Amino acid sequence: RKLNMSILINFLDLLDILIRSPGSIKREEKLEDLKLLFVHVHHLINEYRPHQARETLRVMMEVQKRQRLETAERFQKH
């Protein structure tokens, strides 16, 4: 998140520079380097990290069954 904020700030600074000094022709080349960062962005913010935590939740899944077993304990109370 800090890197994304820094990238947004750097994009604003580059836009201000292009508005103030438009003679830069290599800036677009940096976008190609962003492709490398895009690799990391392939796991950036949306829908891939929580699955890892789901691993731990897997154990909790059986705990959910234990919760059902808790209800089954009522049968013993019967």
């Binding site: 994009f11 800036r27 976008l31 962003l34």
Partner: protein, 48 residues
């Protein structure tokens, strides 16, 4: 007489044609650099 006056006016206008073309080329180069920078920034933003 009108044709000769028109030719004289054209010669007087073309007397500074070198400086006119130089300034026009400088302005065109500056505008092209600005447009290229703006287009590169817009393309990078649209890609991201």
């Amino acid at each position: 007489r009108q044709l000769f006056v028109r030719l004289l006016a054209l010669v007087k206008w073309a007397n500074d044609a070198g400086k006119v073309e130089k300034c026009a080329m400088i302005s065109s180069f500056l505008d092209q650099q600005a447009i290229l920078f703006v287009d590169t920034a817009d393309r990078l933003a649209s890609l991201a």
